[PDB]
Design a protein around this ligand. Sequence first.
Ligand SMILES: [Ca+2]
Ligand SMILES: [Ca+2]
Ligand SMILES: [Ca+2]
Ligand SMILES: [Zn+2]
Ligand SMILES: [Zn+2]
Lengths: 159, 164
Amino acid sequence: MPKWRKTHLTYRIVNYTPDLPRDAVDSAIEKALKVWEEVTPLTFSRLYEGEADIMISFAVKEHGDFYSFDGPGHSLAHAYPPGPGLYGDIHFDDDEKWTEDASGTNLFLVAAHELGHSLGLFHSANTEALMYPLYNSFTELAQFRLSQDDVNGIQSLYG
Amino acid sequence: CTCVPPHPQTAFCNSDLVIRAKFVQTTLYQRYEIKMTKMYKGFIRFVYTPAMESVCGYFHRSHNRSEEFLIAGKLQDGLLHITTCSFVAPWNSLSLAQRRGFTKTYTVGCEECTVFPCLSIPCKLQSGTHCLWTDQLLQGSEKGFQSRHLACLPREPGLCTWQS
Ligand SMILES: [Ca+2]
Ligand SMILES: [Ca+2]
Ligand SMILES: [Ca+2]
Ligand SMILES: [Zn+2]
Ligand SMILES: [Zn+2]
């Protein structure tokens, strides 16, 4: 599906990286959802059981889907566009070291990118977009703001 | 899909095949048909990649079949694989320096040296055999001067440095 055919979405944080206290994972993800919420009619509600739209987890190597992670570096995370079952979900490579700040791989910045794919965005060619596929944003964390390119792409889907 | 960028030296040294080539549904991988014009490493007609960008599938943007591309890839079970985290660039987008790198100079760094991307807050060097790659930090892009004009080479033992 190119987009969610509904406005009110659910997410759940299925498991937790040992890199970070639970509250830290929670705030990062909440913040990442907020970035998108605030330029769209979409809302996101947290589930703690059962099957949510956007299932968010940490995994290493082979982890249930058809795309094994690859150890430290290379790919840091991947995601699936809108749809049922796996579609919508976000997997973070726990062979990276997830951080609250930019001392390691910033969870918030990578969640925010991957959530773009969960909503329907593809990669951007603009090195200044969030949707840029290279871990590209760490220099702007303290006052993070979506690119107009990202704003354009998300509003083209959801108004 | 989110990647650490590879410096061209890194890409060369870690890939199984480095070639110049032209490019000519419910399915896990996509494949492009290619025509190899040159091999720089690996002494080939398709390159495979995850089917969506979201799970790191290279999406080819070029509506010119005679355009040559540098592809640095992993060979697995007979097949050449690339992803959004591979080094893939039009040959002609490379600087002359980078072309010499793939042709001749990058191989000097492979055994002795490592390029380390500065993706983090302090950004600390673990070894004198590392060179710190700060193009993204400095110019907001991996396509900066260190990428396009510098290799990470032995100076003396225990010490690699950036050289042109
Ligand atoms: Ca889902
Ligand atoms: Ca990885
Ligand atoms: Ca980890
Ligand atoms: Zn996965
Ligand atoms: Zn991505």
